[PDB]
Design a protein around this ligand. Structure first.
Ligand SMILES: OC[C@H]1O[C@@H](O[C@H]2[C@H](O)[C@@H](O)[C@H](O)O[C@@H]2CO)[C@H](O)[C@@H](O)[C@H]1O
Length: 132
């Protein structure tokens, strides 16, 4: 999966990620934080994996150890198609904005004020990445 560092997202900025889901997508990932072991956001929508179907699982990682899981019922994704996710942030929390219109929030537990790391994983092939 594609890894990008140094991208310094400051509060208020919007990171748009666009890509295509594999035809038999089981799940894909999007990690944001300071480094691979310090993620303020772990965006793991699961079509079918770990005992979960059509459910988005969010979390944070501190020095390698996971935090409390927060699950979202909304799931506007389909295998073998192209989608995008818009993510914004501030001291409060991050705001994930799904392609189907609605968005939900996830608390900025690690309390960081600058995303610098990003990593995609799973059955998701990135085609575009914008910083608006
Ligand atoms: O929580 C983020 C992280 O979860 C891992 O899976 C969890 C699983 O959801 C939970 O039910 C179990 O008790 O512990 C697992 C931790 O190993 C995922 O493997 C990972 O991709 C993230 O999504």
């Amino acid at each position: 999966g594609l890894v990008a560092s140094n991208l310094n997202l400051k509060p208020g900025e919007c990171l748009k990620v666009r890509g295509e889901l594999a035809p038999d997508a089981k799940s894909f990932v999007l990690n944001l934080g300071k480094d691979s072991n310090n993620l303020c956001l772990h965006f793991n929508p699961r079509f079918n994996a770990h005992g979960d179907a059509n459910t988005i699982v969010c979390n944070s990682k501190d020095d390698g150890t996971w935090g409390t899981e927060q699950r979202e019922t909304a799931f506007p994704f389909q295998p073998g198609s192209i989608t995008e996710v818009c993510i914004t942030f501030d001291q409060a929390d991050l705001t994930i904005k799904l392609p189907d219109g609605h968005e939900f929030k996830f608390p900025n537990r690690l309390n960081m004020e600058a995303i610098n790391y990003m990593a995609a994983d799973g059955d998701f092939k990135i085609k575009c990445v914008a910083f608006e």
